[PDB]
Symmetry: C3
């Protein structure tokens, strides 16, 4: 069991970590579109999707993995009408390597963000 916490990201306040690594796999926390100051970056859903994926890129790096090693993503979104915008940004991060995915519209996310994404990835 390894605990992954990096000051390269907005701190996990309270009782969670950015990721764990266990049995050769990285389990990330859900990322939301905060910058390193813990501010929501934009109201724009594309901009939020980018911040999320950038944050996750960092977690994967710090955990000993990368984007091309991701097995599964779960995308929780506030509006399914944003799906095409989100998908466009997501497809910039997952271009050649295409993980398994689920995407659902939830009722509400932390801090009223529009998109939250969690990954399961293999250690390199």
């Amino acid at each position: 069991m390894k605990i992954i916490n990096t000051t390269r990201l907005p701190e996990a306040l309270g009782p969670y970590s950015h990721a764990t690594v266990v049995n050769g796999m990285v389990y990330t926390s859900g990322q939301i579109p905060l910058n390193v100051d813990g501010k929501i970056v934009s109201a724009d859903v594309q901009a939020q999707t980018k911040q999320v994926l950038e944050n996750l890129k960092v977690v994967l790096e710090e955990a000993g993995s990368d984007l091309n090693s991701v097995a599964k993503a779960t995308i929780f979104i506030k509006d399914m009408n944003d799906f095409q915008k989100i998908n466009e940004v997501y497809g910039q991060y997952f271009n050649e390597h295409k993980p398994a995915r689920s995407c659902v519209e939830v009722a509400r996310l932390p801090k009223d963000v529009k998109v939250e994404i969690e990954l399961v990835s293999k250690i390199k």
Copy 2:
């Protein structure tokens, strides 16, 4: 990292794959009740549940797993008042083998379907 795609499902057009296999485990994408032509098969929630599970069966089999090898299912539904009906269909597929599961009602699913199911399963004999 093995990427799984099967021509018995509608083509993964978009940045995903029907499933991946990593460390002897299969992670499927969430399946929705589309046939191979990308069309929703029925409005009926039981017919949708059946199509989801048949779609998952083909993904598992293409990956070298099967429904009896499932570790965990997550069932996202549009209406909890349909739970017992969805449950009845799911129990026809998971009769002998009873994996772990969660089931929650979401606000909306892709293409306004009523049910989406993802699975984590183990590869047979390796």
Copy 3:
């Protein structure tokens, strides 16, 4: 032919009625079913959200123990909730259980939970 794993169903909790099990153990990981706040008699324990969160975490402690795991071995939790206004109260209880070890987590507001409960939690854990 089926891939080898251990199915967990303990008499310490209300039976999983129908086509699921309390947990599975596969390739050194425990996958729990989502736990809702049912008491030893199978009933919703209380309307209070902190009582429900306690009951969920105590149920999950049971499942993890019976599977050969423990809270210190959890990789990832997902907390599904009915109302983000309960998050502070839920988090206060969660943090009492995950005080020394802090797993990866996601928390989302869903439209509805089984039995109209306010919180449901699932875990993925290592064998201890």
